[PDB]
mmCIF file of N, CA and C (backbone and C1' of nucleotides) and ligand atoms in Angstrom:
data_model
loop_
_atom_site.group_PDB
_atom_site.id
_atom_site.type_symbol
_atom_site.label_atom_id
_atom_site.label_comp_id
_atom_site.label_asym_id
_atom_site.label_seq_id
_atom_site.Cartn_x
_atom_site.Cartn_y
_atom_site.Cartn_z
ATOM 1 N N UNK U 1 80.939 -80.743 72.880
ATOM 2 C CA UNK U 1 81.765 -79.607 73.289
ATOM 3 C C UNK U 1 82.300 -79.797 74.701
ATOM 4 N N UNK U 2 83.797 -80.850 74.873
ATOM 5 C CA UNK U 2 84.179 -80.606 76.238
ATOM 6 C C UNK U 2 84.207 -79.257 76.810
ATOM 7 N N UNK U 3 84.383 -79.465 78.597
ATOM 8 C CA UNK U 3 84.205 -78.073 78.729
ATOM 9 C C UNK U 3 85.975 -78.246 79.084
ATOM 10 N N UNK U 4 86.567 -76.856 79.278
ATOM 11 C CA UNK U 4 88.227 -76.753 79.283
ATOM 12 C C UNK U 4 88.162 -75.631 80.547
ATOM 13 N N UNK U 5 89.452 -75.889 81.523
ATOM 14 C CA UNK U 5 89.379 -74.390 82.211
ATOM 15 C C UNK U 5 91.201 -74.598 81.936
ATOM 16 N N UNK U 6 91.691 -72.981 82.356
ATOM 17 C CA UNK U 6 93.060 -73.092 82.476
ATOM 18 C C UNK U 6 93.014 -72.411 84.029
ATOM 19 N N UNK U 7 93.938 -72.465 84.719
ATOM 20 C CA UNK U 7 94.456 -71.844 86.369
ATOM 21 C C UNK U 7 95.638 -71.843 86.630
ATOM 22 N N UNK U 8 96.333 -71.313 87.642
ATOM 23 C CA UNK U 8 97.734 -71.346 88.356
ATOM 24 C C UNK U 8 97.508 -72.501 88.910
ATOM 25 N N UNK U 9 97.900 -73.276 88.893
ATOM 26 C CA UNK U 9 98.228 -74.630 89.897
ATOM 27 C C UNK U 9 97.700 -74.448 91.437
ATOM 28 N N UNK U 10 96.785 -74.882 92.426
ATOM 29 C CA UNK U 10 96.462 -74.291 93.544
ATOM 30 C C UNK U 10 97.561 -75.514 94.408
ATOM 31 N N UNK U 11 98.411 -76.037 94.183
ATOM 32 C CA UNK U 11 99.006 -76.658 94.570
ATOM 33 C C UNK U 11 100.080 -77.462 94.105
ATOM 34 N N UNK U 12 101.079 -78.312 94.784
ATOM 35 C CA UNK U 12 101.962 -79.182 94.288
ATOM 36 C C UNK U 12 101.189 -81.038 94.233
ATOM 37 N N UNK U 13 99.884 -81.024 94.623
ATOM 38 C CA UNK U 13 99.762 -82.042 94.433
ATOM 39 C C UNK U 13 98.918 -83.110 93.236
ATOM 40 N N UNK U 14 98.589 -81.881 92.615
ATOM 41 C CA UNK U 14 98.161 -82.628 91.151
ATOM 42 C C UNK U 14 99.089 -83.150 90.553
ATOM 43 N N UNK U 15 98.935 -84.036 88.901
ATOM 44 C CA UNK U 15 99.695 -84.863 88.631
ATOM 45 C C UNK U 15 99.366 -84.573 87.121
ATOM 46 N N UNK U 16 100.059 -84.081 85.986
ATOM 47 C CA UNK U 16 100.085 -84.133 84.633
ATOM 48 C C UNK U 16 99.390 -85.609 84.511
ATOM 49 N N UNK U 17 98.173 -85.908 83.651
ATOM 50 C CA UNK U 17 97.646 -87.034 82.979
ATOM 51 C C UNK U 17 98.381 -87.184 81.490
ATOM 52 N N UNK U 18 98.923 -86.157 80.904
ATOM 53 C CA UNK U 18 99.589 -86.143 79.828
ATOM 54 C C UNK U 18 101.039 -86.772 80.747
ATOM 55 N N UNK U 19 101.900 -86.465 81.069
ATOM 56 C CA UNK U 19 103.337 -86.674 81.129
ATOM 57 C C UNK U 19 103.097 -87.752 82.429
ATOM 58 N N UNK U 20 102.324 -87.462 82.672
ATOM 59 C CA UNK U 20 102.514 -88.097 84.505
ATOM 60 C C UNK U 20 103.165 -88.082 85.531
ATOM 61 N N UNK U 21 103.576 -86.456 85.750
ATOM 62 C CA UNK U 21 104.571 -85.809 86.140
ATOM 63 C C UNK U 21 103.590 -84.882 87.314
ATOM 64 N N UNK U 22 104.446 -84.505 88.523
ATOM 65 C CA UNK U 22 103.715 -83.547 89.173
ATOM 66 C C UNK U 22 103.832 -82.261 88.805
ATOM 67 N N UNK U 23 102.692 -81.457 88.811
ATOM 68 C CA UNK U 23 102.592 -80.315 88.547
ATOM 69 C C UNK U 23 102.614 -78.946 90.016
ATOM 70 N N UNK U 24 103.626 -78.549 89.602
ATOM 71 C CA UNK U 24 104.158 -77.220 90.749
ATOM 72 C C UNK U 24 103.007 -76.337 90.925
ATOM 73 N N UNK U 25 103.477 -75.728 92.408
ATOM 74 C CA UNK U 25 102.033 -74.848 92.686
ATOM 75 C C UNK U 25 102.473 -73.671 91.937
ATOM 76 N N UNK U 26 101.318 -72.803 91.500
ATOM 77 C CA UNK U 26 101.977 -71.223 90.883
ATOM 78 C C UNK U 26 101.540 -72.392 89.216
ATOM 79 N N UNK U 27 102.210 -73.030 88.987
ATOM 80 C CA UNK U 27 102.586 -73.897 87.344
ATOM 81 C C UNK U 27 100.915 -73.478 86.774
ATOM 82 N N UNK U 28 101.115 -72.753 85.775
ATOM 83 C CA UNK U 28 99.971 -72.768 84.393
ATOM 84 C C UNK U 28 99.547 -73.953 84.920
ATOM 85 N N UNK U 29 98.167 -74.014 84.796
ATOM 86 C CA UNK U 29 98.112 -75.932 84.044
ATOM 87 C C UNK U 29 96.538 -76.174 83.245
ATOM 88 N N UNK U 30 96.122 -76.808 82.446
ATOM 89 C CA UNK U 30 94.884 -76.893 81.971
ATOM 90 C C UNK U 30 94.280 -78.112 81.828
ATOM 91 N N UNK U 31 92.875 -78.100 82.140
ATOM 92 C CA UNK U 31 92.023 -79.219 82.429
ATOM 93 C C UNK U 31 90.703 -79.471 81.200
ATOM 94 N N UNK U 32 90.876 -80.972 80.914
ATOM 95 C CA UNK U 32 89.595 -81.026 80.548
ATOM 96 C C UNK U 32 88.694 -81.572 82.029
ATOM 97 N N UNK U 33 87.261 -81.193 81.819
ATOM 98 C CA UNK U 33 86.648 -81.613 83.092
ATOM 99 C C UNK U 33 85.639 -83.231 82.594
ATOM 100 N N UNK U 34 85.945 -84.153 82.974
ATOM 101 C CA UNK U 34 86.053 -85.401 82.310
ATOM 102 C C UNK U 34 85.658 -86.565 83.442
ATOM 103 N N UNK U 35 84.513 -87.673 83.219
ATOM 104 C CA UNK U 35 84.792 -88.716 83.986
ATOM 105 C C UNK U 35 85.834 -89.402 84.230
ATOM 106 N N UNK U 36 86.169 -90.290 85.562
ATOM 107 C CA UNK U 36 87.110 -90.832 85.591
ATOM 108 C C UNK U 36 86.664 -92.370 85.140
ATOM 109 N N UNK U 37 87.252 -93.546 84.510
ATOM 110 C CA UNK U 37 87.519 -94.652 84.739
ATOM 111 C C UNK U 37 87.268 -95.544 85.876
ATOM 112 N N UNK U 38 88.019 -95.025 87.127
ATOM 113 C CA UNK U 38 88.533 -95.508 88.107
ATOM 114 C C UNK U 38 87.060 -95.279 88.658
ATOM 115 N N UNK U 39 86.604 -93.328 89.078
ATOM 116 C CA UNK U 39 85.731 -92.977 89.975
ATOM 117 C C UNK U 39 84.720 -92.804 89.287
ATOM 118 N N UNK U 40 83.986 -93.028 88.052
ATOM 119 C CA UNK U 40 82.854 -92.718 87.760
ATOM 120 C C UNK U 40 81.783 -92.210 88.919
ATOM 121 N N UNK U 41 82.011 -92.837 89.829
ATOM 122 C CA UNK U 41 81.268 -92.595 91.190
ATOM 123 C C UNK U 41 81.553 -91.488 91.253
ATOM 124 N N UNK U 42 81.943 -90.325 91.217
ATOM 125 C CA UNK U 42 82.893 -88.984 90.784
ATOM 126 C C UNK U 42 81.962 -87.812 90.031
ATOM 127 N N UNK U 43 81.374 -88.598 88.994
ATOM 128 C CA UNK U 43 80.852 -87.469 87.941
ATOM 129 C C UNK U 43 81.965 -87.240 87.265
ATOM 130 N N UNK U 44 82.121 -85.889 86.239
ATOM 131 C CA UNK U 44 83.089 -85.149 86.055
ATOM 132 C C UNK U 44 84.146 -84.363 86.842
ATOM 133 N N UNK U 45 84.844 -85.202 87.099
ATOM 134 C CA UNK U 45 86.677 -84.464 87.465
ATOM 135 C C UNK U 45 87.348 -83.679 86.928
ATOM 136 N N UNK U 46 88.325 -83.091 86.982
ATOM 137 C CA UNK U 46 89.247 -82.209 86.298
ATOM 138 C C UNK U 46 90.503 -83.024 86.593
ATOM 139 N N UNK U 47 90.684 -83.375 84.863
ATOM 140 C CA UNK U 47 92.032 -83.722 84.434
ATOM 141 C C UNK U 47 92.945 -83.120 84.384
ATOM 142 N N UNK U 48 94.235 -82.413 84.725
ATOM 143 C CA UNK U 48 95.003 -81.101 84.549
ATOM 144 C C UNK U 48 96.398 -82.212 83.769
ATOM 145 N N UNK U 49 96.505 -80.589 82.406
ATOM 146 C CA UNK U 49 97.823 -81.358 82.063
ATOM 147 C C UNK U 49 98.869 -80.278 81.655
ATOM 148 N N UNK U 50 100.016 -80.522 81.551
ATOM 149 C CA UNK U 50 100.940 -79.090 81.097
ATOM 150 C C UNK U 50 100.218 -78.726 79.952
ATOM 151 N N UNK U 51 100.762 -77.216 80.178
ATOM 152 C CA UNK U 51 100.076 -76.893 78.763
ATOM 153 C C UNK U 51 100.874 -77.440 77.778
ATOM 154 N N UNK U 52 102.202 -77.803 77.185
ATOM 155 C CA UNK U 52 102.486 -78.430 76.677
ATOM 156 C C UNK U 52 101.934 -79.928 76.117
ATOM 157 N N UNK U 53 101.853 -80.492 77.574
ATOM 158 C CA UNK U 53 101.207 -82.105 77.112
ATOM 159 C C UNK U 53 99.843 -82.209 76.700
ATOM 160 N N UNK U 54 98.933 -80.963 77.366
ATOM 161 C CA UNK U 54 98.011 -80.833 76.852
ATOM 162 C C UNK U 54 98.320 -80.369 75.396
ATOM 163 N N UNK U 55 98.524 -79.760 74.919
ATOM 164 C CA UNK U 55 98.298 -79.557 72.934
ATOM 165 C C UNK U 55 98.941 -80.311 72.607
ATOM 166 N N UNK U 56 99.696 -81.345 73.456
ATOM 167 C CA UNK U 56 100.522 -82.716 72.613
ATOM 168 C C UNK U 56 98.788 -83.335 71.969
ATOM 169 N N UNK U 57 98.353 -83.435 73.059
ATOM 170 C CA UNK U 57 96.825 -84.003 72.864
ATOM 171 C C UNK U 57 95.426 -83.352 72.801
ATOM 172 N N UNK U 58 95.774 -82.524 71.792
ATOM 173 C CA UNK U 58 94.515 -81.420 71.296
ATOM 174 C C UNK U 58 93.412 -81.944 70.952
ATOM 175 N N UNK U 59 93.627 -83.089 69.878
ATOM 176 C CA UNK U 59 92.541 -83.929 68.896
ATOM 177 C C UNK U 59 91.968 -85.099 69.934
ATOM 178 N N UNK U 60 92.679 -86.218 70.870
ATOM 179 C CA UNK U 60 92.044 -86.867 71.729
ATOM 180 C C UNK U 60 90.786 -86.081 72.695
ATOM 181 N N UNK U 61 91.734 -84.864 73.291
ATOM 182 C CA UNK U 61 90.768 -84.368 74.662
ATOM 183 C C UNK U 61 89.874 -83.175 73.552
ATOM 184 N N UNK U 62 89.451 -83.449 72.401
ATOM 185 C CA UNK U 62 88.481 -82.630 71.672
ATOM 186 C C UNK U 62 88.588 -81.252 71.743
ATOM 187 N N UNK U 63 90.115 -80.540 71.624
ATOM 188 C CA UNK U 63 90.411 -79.570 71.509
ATOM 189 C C UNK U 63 90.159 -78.984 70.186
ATOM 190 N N UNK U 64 89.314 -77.598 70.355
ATOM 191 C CA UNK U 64 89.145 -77.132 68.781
ATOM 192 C C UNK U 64 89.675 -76.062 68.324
ATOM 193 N N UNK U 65 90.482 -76.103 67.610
ATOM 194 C CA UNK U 65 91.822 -74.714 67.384
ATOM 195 C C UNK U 65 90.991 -74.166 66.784
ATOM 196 N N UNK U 66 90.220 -73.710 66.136
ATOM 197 C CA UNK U 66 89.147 -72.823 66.018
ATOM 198 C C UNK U 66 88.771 -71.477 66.472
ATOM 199 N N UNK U 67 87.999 -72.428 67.721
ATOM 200 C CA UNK U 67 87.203 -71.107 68.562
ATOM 201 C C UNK U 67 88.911 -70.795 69.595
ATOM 202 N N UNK U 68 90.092 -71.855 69.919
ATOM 203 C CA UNK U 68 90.852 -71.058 70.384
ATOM 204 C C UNK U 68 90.990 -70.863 71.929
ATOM 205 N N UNK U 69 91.539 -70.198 72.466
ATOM 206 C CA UNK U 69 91.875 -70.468 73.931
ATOM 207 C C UNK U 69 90.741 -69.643 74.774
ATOM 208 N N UNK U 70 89.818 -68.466 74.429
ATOM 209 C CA UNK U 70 88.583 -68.478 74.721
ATOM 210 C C UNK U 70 87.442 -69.371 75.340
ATOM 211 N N UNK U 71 88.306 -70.897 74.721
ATOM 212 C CA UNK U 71 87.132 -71.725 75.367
ATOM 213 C C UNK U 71 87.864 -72.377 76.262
ATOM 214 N N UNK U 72 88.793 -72.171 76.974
ATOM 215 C CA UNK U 72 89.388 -72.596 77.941
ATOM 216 C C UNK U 72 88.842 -71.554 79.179
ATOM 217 N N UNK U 73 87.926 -72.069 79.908
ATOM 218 C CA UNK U 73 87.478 -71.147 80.725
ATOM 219 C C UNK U 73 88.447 -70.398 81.698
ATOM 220 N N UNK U 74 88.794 -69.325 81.993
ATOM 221 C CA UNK U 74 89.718 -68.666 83.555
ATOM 222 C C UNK U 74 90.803 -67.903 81.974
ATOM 223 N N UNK U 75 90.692 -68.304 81.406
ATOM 224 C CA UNK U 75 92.187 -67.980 80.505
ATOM 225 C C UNK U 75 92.241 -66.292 80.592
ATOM 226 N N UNK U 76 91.044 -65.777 80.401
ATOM 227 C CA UNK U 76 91.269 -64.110 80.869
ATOM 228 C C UNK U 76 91.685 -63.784 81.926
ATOM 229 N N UNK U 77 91.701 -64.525 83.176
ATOM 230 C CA UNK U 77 91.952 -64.323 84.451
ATOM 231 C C UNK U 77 93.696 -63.923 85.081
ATOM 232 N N UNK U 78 94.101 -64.472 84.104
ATOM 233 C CA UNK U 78 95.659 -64.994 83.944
ATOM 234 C C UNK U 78 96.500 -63.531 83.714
ATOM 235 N N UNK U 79 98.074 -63.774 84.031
ATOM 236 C CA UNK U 79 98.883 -62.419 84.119
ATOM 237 C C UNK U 79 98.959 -62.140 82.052
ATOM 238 N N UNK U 80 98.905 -61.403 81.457
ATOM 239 C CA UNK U 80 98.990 -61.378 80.206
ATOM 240 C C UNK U 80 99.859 -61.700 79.642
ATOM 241 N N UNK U 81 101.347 -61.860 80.888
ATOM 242 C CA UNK U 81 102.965 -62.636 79.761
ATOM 243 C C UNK U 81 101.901 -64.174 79.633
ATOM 244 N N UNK U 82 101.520 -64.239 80.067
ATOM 245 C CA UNK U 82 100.821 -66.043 80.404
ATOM 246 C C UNK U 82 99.563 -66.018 79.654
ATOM 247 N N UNK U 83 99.077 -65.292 79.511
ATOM 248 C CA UNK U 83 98.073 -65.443 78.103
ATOM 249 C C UNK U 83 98.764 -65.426 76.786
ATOM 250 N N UNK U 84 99.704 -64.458 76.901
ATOM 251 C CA UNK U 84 100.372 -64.447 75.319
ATOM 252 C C UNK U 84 101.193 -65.965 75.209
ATOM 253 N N UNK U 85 102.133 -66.420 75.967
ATOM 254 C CA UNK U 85 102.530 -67.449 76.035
ATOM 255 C C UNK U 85 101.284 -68.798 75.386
ATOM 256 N N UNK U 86 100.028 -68.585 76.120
ATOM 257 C CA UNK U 86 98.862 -69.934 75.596
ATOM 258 C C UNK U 86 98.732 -69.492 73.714
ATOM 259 N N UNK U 87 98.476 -68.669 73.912
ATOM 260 C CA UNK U 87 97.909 -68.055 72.433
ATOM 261 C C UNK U 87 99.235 -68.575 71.553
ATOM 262 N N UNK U 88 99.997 -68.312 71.848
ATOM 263 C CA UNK U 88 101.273 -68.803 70.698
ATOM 264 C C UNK U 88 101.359 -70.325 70.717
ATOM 265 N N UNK U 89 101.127 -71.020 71.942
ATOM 266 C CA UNK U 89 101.087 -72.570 72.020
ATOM 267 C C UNK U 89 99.974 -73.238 71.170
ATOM 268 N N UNK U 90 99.038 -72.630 70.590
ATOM 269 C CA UNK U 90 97.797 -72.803 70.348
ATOM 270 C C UNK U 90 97.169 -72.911 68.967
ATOM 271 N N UNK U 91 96.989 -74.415 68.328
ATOM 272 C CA UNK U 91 96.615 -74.753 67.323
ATOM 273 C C UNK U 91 95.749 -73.989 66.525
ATOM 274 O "O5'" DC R 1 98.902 -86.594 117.160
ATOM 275 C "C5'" DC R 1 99.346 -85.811 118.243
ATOM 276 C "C4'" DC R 1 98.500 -84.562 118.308
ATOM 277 C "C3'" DC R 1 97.192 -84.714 117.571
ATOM 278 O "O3'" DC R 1 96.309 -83.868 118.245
ATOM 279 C "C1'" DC R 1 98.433 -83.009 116.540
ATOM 280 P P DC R 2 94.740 -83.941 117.938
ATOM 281 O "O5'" DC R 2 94.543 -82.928 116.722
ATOM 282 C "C5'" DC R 2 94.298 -81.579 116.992
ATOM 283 C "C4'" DC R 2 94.065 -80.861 115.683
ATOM 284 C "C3'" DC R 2 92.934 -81.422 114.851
ATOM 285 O "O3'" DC R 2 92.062 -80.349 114.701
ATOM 286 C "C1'" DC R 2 94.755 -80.870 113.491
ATOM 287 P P DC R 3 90.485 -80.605 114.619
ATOM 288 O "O5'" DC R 3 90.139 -80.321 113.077
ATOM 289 C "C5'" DC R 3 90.334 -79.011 112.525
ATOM 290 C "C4'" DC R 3 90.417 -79.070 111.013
ATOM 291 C "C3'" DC R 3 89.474 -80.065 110.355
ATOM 292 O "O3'" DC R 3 88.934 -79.498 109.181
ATOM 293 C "C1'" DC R 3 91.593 -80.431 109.548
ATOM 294 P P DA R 4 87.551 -78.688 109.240
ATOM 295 O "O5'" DA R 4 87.542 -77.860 107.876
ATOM 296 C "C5'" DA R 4 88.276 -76.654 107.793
ATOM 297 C "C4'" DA R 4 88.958 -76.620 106.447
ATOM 298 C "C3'" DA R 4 88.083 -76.823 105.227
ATOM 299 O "O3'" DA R 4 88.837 -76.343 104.170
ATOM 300 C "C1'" DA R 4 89.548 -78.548 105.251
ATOM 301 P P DA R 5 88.166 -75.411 103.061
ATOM 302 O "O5'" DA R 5 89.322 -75.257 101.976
ATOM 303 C "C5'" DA R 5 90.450 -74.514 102.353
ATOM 304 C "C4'" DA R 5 91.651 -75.057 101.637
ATOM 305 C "C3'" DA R 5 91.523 -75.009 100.143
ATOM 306 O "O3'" DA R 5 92.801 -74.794 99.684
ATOM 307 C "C1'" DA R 5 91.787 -77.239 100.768
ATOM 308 P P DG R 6 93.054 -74.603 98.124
ATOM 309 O "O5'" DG R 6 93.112 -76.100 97.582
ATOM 310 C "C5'" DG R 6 94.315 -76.792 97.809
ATOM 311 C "C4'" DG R 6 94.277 -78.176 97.201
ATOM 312 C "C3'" DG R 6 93.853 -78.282 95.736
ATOM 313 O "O3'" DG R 6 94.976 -78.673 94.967
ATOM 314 C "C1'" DG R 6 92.868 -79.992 97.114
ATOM 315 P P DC R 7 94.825 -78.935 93.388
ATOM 316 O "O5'" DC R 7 94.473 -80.485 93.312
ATOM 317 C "C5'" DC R 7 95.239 -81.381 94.080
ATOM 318 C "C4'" DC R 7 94.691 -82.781 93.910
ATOM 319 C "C3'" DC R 7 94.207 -83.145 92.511
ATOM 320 O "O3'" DC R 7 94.800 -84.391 92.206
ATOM 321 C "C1'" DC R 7 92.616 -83.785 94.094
ATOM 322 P P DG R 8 94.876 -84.904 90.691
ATOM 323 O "O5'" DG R 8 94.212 -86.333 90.766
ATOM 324 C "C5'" DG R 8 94.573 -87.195 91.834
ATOM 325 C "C4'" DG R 8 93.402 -88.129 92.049
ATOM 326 C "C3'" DG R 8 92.789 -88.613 90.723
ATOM 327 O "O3'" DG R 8 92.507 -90.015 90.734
ATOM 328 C "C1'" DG R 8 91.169 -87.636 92.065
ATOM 329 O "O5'" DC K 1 79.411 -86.747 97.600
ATOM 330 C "C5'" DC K 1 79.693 -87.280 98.901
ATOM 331 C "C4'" DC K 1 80.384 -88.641 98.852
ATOM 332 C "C3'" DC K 1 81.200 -88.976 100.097
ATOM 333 O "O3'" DC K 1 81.233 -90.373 100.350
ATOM 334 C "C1'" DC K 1 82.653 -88.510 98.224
ATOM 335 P P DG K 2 81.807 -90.923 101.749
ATOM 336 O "O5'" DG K 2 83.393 -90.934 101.532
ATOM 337 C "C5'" DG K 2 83.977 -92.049 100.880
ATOM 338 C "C4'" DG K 2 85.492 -91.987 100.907
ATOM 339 C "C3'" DG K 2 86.141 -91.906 102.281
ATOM 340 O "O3'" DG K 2 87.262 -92.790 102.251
ATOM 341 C "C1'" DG K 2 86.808 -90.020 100.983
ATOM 342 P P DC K 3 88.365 -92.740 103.418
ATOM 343 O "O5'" DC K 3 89.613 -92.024 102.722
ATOM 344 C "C5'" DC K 3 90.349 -92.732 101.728
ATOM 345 C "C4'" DC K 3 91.586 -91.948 101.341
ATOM 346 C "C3'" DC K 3 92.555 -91.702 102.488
ATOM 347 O "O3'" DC K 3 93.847 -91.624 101.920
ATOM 348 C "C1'" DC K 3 91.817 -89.641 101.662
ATOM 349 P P DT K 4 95.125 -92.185 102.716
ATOM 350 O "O5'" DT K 4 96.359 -91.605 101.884
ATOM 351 C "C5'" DT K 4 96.099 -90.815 100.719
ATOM 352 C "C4'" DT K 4 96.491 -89.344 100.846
ATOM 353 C "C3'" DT K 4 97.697 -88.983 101.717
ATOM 354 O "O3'" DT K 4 98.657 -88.486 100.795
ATOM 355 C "C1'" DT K 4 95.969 -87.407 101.961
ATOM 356 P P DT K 5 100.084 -87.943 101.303
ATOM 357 O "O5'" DT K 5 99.766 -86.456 101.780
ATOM 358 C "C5'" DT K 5 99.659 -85.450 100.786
ATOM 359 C "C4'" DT K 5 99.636 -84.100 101.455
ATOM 360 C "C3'" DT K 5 100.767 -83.892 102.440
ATOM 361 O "O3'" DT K 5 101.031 -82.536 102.381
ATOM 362 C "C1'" DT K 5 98.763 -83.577 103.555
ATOM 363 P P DG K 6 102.391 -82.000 101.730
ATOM 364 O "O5'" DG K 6 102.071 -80.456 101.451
ATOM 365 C "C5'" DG K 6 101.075 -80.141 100.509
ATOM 366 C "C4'" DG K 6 100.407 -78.851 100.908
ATOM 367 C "C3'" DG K 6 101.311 -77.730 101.340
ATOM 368 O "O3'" DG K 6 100.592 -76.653 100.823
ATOM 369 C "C1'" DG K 6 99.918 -78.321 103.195
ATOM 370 P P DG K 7 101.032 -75.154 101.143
ATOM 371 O "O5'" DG K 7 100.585 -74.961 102.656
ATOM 372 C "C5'" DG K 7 99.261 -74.560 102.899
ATOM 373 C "C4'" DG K 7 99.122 -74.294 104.379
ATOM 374 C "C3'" DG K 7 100.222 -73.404 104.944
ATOM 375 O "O3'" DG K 7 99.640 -72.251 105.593
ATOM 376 C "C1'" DG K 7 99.908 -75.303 106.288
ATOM 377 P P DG K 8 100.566 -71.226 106.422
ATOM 378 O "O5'" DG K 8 99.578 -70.599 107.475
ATOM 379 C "C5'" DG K 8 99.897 -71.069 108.785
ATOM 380 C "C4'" DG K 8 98.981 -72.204 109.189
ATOM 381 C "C3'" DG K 8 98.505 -72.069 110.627
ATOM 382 O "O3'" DG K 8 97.091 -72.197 110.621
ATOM 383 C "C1'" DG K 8 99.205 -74.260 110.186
HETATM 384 ZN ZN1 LIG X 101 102.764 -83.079 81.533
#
DNA sequence: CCCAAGCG
DNA sequence: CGCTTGGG
């Protein structure tokens, strides 16, 4: 059971792992929290990807349309046009 | 110049 | 953790 969070972007300097694109501050964005490759030295990181590129890749990052955007941790936290928006994106 | 939020 | 850099 990866763990998932969703947030407002706390910045312009993260980087979509899906698109490989920078992600805007304010910008939705969602993470699996995941070793790195590179930093194993790291532990678990947070991967952030559009929400788009993320459900491009639901089945790789062990997304389970199932239980649903609930298990994306923070997702209640969010303005409700922006929850309804995930929920419709959502396998 | 400065430095900790932010990210990786 | 260590580096880059937004935001003073
Ligand atoms: Zn992307």
């Amino acid at each position: 059971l990866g763990d998932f969070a969703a947030e407002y972007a706390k910045s312009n300097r993260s980087t979509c792992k899906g698109c490989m694109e920078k992600i805007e501050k304010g910008q939705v964005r969602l993470s699996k929290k995941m070793v790195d490759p590179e930093k194993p030295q790291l532990g678990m990181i947070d991967r952030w990807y559009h929400p788009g590129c993320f459900v491009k890749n639901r089945e790789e990052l062990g997304f389970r349309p199932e239980y649903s955007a609930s298990q994306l941790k923070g997702f209640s936290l969010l303005a409700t046009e922006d929850k309804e928006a995930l929920k419709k994106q959502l396998p």
